[PDB]
């Protein structure tokens, strides 16, 4: 390096820093990925149960 025009310097390298990023959820494998073909998805649901039986 050169300080001004007639003087020299000592160069000590560079310092770098990056921000944090969290990855807790990705480590839990909690989601399942599907690859479709269009921008519409359909889901179907079914319910069932039981009932009473009165005396006869």
């Amino acid at each position: 390096m050169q300080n001004g025009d007639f003087q020299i310097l000592d160069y000590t390298g560079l310092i770098s820093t990056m921000p944090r990023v969290d990855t807790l959820l990705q480590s839990m494998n909690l989601f399942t990925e599907h690859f479709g073909r269009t921008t519409v998805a359909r889901i179907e649901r079914l319910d069932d149960g039981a009932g009473d039986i009165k005396a006869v």
Binding site: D48, G49, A50, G51, D52, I53, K54, A55, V56
Partner: protein, 55 residues
């Protein structure tokens, strides 16, 4: 599907009937003919050990 529904409905009734016995009464929801009250039938009474948690 209908067969499974029928099985589950009978199973539920059995549990309800078993539970109704502890309170001292027979289980016959829709029939007065067999609606027995065991405390009355055998001539006994119910004792209550009431507990107070507020003190």
């Amino acid at each position: 599907r209908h067969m499974a529904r029928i099985r589950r409905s009978h199973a539920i009734l059995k549990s309800k009937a078993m539970y109704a016995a502890l309170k001292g009464t027979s289980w016959s929801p829709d029939d007065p003919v067999s609606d027995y009250n065991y405390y009355d039938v055998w001539g006994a009474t119910q004792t209550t050990a009431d507990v107070d948690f507020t003190k």
